[PDB]
Symmetry: C3
Subunit: 515 residues, 3 copies
């Protein structure tokens, strides 16, 4: 054996590639103009507390912006605050408050209805995208890293603009959204705050994924958007966990008043320079479905801030989930189904173990510990840090401090927000090689998750294991006005025989959707 | 209608692209050496307080570095500080203090003079570039996010190295620049600080835009740089707004002494491996011009920290701006023309509305509110967050706190620094399709800006609306020694008929300048 | 002279590149599965304090993950802590604690032994890579910015998860690694903390550089890993400099107990879709060598927090370093050879000057001041800020505060961690153009470094100037099982005549190694 001959190259700086008449060109520009925005009012008066069906109906010729936005404005009254609380860096909005407040939405484009679930869509998408991309969707794009929020915490998401490390990554007042706090009298136990939130609608077939440069829709003879409006305090208002309550009150009481809503769209004539618009335009419109869920009361007997190994290992196992084709990705999370406190972070469990069954293949990922489950999820787009994901004790030295008495340990204890595990069928390493993304092949799946919860010793709460699927799904816009959508399914043999793609395509006009 | 047939591909990791003799090559390197730096002294002794004309004159054969740097050193005495003030995280330099201190500069290259205005150039460029790119221009590249700077504020730009979230993005002591504080006696009301600032000169035709990998200049038989030196305390020294004054003093008094200045260049022989240097070398050298300005006294009757809707809507409208060709970009800002406090941030207004007239087309962008104006500016390179841009109350909870009395509300209130709106002619969405970037066509423009200011109720100040143009302008270096510069102008018909560019060029050597 | 004609293009958004059947394709996927992890125990019981030889021996067929990980777990008892110290944000691990604890490692692949020095490798690599890449190697990837760590410091690397600006970039508890603090009784002067660290092995031929997507090894009939285990407290445990000691104690006393260690690998069967594995696979496996070192006692007579110009200019000059070929990069650092405090940061000097001799060419880089040395090092991958690199006083206002008495100046004074200067032979700008990266040409090098140290006046310590080389070195895996490694050397004339590469290759499957 001998090493093979390797050819040589002489690297030199790009500065020596001299700009000349042979390699320089002057650009002019056309673009999507900003003189083209219009405000669409709903067909009837929106409910003053934001609870009820809301409908928009507006035909639009030519091009319509692919990421239309909903603009809500309202007053929130927060009661049962201890008298003369400063509330510095302690009040704000929850993450993606518009889409979190819409359990279901129906969009009609030229007689074709699209039914989707924005609250579910954004619940997954918020953990699975570039933060700067998410900041263009919502002014409240930052997601909670920890299960309790306190004023001093460094990345406290209710920090004001001047008190935040990055005001873009805060949901506090004086950050990305307009607000006004009503005057607070001395001795007052309540506060009124006006809000305005301009957020992109996360619902099929909108282009929330391509919010950087969204492909517009064309020639909408019929265009309706029907929302299940659930803009209730629990889906919007956030209060830090160290805000003190009035004596004899368990939780804060919040009321939404003066609720208004409009849809903001861009509408413009296509320029002649780009040429004739093609007969059939394709749009990436992912189908998210809850494949299975199951819950149980989880009772902690031992301290969650104590020895990590002695934390109560709660187990939930789904029923068999029948699927007629293979999704491109799955998402697993264990969350508190009925929250105790309405305005605190979403209580997710720290998943410490995961075993998966697919048809006859059993015990997949059984060997994996938290670090590898984090690595797995991160490799499929999970956008947060291990301190959050793990659900482990985040401030052990603060709690272990002997100055903190035994009765106040739990109060001081702050945990990571919890786990969301994204996995693809290729990660499973199935000996059945026909089980591949977008394969037209039926399968049965069962998911068991072992997890730890942040509740104190002698207390408990209900937790639900959820398994979602993210299927590749396209929407087709035909020249005659018709809209259709379908899954992109092929036989195992087609996909196995297809050409390899180890890199991006050299032709930059090409797009490779799904997988 | 039926969905079209789509071809399939099988994606696999880059790890499976095995390195072999067929796809591996070994590199060696040549580069711009670091043994090549020269210090050029000015022709005469520089003024000890940094006020006056400063001239460099140095012929240089072969290749000269495209981004030459000015290195200033001086002592600053700050007086009227309250006795025994700690000054922790409260003293530093303003952003780009070298270029901010040069209102005009003349560079001569082989008989061709280039006249530019560095203070204007950098005032725009600081808001319109990648932060890491800007950190290579100046050690004081961080721009103010808020109109008042206080010691506690999280991104306080006078935070010391150990107290900063990112010492690169601070302008404090113990960050990117050398300094020395003279010993402070107990009871002293003044402090002396030595500074040294090594900053790239932002003046045509220097390659401040391509600071990463600048294209060098060749064979400078004549090379002169003539600066209007205005290195005043007001253009350099920063003092936090919560530093307390001596009794009976309105503002701090600052004196510059021991001012020295040199120019740092790289000069080297071109390597033979890159081949013959081409006959004509092209350089990107943007032309920034103040197209129009107008000002007025703006009196606030209502509190700026009060109801945002009731903040005084000040209006300024430019005269008709005649232009013989169409610039690629415009910039609009409303700024305080005579500052009250000399060492505080530049007070910009929060622009809440913008009406633009171009020829017979009137009322463009009238529908746009702050979020969309921010989106517009950000899409054309604006590099700061909404909390800053908006000019809105940044710390509402701190101010609304009942512990803060009515007389101290204003003192506690901190606002966003204010708006800078970048827009292209394509953003306007004009009926007249001949109005395109780099079109050789005459136009008349008028700009009206509606804005709010940060001054208290019963006070006011003078604010000037400025409308800048950023024209595409190239500098040509001919083999015989001649330098020329010209705008890159073409007929509307030429530009309309040109080939479309939806993506970057596949050939990596190709540059596409302007647009 | 006249400007040349330049061709025009019309730029337009990527949204107008409509997705159609002509430019869209649907992907399916294969990937490196997560069902494939194995835990390998060592051949004998690991030493309970982590001191001794540790050997792994495990044959592995098919594909083995190119970046195998070592997982250490242990208990650390820290004694001599002042009674009832809170220890908030004051205890954690040093950077890369696994690899720092291994002075030498031998890896056997099918009879071919690779001897490397992980502690040296990571000492350089931690300063010379993308932080997000480094975070995948170790949970303690953040490197010290300053020579002293205090609790209040903004980027204090022992900040807990909830107290960190970025928990990924902290080495504190409740961040990237599992831990447990044993209960602390009132009046206790010691604390016991369990740790678990899962860290990639940095040793030839592992793919620690390509940690994102590592190329796996194949068909290991013999696979042994022999470690010089030096998992001692000084290489792992970190204690903040403002933690107070028990009366009559000079330093903290720490000992390791319950030490265990395993190796985590991925092992899987290559999928048939990628085709036949090529005969010879190439791996990038850089060779780092200590070319020369020299030391001396460095006594500071004047205050390091005083006038920067009056700080003692210590000089160290290496002996002549004979090398038979030209390395692609060099690294220079001046470090404290025997630390005074065992659990504080590594004390590096601030290098203010650097003279280099190569053969008959003397005084290279003699003109360069600290800003240019920082620029030089950063252009070759140095990943930290000037505040750190310079070694200058980081908190001058804090120290110059008259409230701080003359005797407490040094205690308050915090300095940048110090300099690491990376330079290539092309940076030197030698007359002798045959001295190029990977040239098979012998040379003699001498390096002189002028530097300042952070020790107080009337004290001193031993500092060693180290000069490392980073040679391009490839490992070849032959189909018959054989492994070889060699430097990639060519004649000067071969490299000079090779084709120019001003940009990346258009073919994305091509790799260009070294240079």
């Amino acid at each position: 054996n001998t090493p093979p001959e390797l050819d040589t190259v002489l690297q030199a700086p790009y500065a020596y590639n001299w700009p000349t008449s042979k390699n320089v060109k002057i650009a002019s520009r056309i673009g999507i103009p900003y003189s083209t925005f219009q405000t669409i009012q709903p067909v009837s008066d929106a409910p003053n507390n934001g609870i009820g069906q809301i409908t928009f109906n507006q035909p639009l010729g030519n091009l319509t912006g692919g990421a239309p936005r909903l603009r809500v404005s309202f007053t929130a009254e927060i009661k049962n605050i201890l008298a003369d609380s400063s509330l510095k860096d302690q009040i704000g909005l929850k993450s993606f408050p518009v889409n979190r407040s819409i359990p279901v939405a129906v969009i009609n484009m030229n007689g074709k209805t699209f039914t989707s679930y924005p609250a579910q869509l954004i619940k997954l998408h918020q953990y699975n995208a570039d933060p700067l991309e998410l900041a263009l969707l919502s002014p409240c794009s930052d997601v909670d890293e920890y299960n309790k929020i306190k004023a001093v915490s460094m990345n406290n998401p209710y920090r004001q603009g001047t008190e935040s490390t990055d005001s873009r990554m805060s949901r506090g007042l004086g950050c990305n959204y307009a607000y006004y706090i009503h005057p607070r009298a001395a001795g007052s136990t309540s506060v009124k705050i006006d809000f305005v939130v301009d957020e992109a609608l996360v619902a099929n077939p909108t282009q929330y994924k391509n919010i950087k440069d969204p492909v517009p829709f064309r020639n909408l003879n019929t265009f309706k958007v029907i929302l299940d409006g659930q803009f209730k305090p629990e889906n919007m208002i956030g209060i830090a966990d160290d805000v003190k309550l009035v004596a004899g009150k368990a939780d804060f009481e919040v009321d939404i008043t003066g609720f208004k809503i409009n849809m903001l769209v861009q509408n413009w004539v296509a320029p002649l320079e780009i040429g004739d618009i093609p007969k059939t335009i394709i749009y990436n419109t992912p189908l998210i479905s809850l494949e299975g869920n199951i819950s149980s009361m989880c009772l902690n007997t031992k301290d969650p801030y104590g020895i990590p190994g002695e934390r109560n290992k709660h187990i939930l196992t789904t029923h068999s989930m029948a699927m007629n084709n293979v999704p491109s990705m799955f998402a697993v999370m264990v969350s508190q189904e009925t929250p105790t406190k309405k305005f605190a972070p979403d209580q997710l469990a720290g998943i410490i173990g995961l075993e998966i069954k697919v048809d006859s293949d059993v015990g997949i990922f059984r060997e994996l510990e938290q670090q590898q489950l984090y690595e797995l999820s991160s490799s499929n787009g999970y956008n947060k840090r291990f301190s959050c994901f793990s659900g482990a004790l985040a401030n052990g030295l603060t709690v272990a401090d002997p100055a903190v008495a035994a009765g106040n340990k739990f109060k001081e204890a702050i945990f990571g927000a919890g786990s969301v595990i994204f996995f693809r069928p290729s990660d499973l390493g199935l000996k059945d090689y026909n089980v591949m993304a977008n394969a037209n092949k039926s399968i049965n799946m069962q998911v068991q998750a072992t997890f730890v919860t942040p509740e104190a010793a002698g207390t408990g709460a209900h937790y639900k294991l959820e398994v979602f699927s993210i299927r590749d799904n396209l929407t087709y816009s035909f020249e005659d006005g018709t809209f259709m959508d379908d899954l992109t399914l092929y036989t195992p043999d087609q996909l196995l025989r297809s050409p390899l793609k180890l890199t991006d395509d050299n032709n930059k006009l090409m797009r490779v959707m799904g997988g």
